[PDB]
Design a protein around this ligand. Sequence first.
Ligand SMILES: C[C@@H](N[C@@H](CCc1ccccc1)C(=O)N[C@@H](CCCNC(N)=[NH2+])C(=O)Nc1ccccc1)C(=O)O
Ligand SMILES: [Ca+2]
Ligand SMILES: [Ca+2]
Ligand SMILES: [Ca+2]
Ligand SMILES: [Zn+2]
Ligand SMILES: [Zn+2]
Length: 168
Amino acid sequence: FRTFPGIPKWRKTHLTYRIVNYTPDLPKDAVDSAVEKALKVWEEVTPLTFSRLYEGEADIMISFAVREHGDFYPFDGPGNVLAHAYAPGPGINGDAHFDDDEQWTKDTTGTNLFLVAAHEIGHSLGLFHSANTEALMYPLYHSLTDLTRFRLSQDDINGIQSLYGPPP
Ligand SMILES: C[C@@H](N[C@@H](CCc1ccccc1)C(=O)N[C@@H](CCCNC(N)=[NH2+])C(=O)Nc1ccccc1)C(=O)O
Ligand SMILES: [Ca+2]
Ligand SMILES: [Ca+2]
Ligand SMILES: [Ca+2]
Ligand SMILES: [Zn+2]
Ligand SMILES: [Zn+2]
């Protein structure tokens, strides 16, 4: 696995997130679930905990957008870049943005929001890209035949634990 240069990481174990807005593709509940599951993935292997906020600034601000969306990294329309997030830190750092120009499905027929959310969150916590192809943190998304066979690789776990340690 690889972490970001300088090894930036949250200096606290309890992070707040806030789904700023939703995609029209899925009902609010399918979106909420996808992100709770997303975070749960990391919560299970570290001493990290998360609480949701509806107002103000959360550590991880989550939102769906297209093309120019208020940052130095515009989305590219359909395909290619699906979403992007920022390594741990203040302000925009830690936030995750999802290209709403994709078709967010809750399965593998389009772009699965659960998986993408899971990968991007890996970035919000300090994990960069892995060279292992079976690792969630691998550079490219790929159509999983099964969402029921998904699990973090020992690599993704090794990495997150090297940063926040194992769960107490
Ligand atoms: C770029 C950004 N977002 C990635 C997430 C990919 C991912 C991996 C594993 C699970 C879920 C999601 C992203 O959007 N990647 C694109 C490709 C970017 C290519 N850029 C480049 N080579 N310079 C991606 O995987 N796209 C894609 C689109 C349709 C189907 C399959 C994959 C990042 O993490 O740095
Ligand atoms: Ca933030
Ligand atoms: Ca795109
Ligand atoms: Ca969309
Ligand atoms: Zn953005
Ligand atoms: Zn990535």
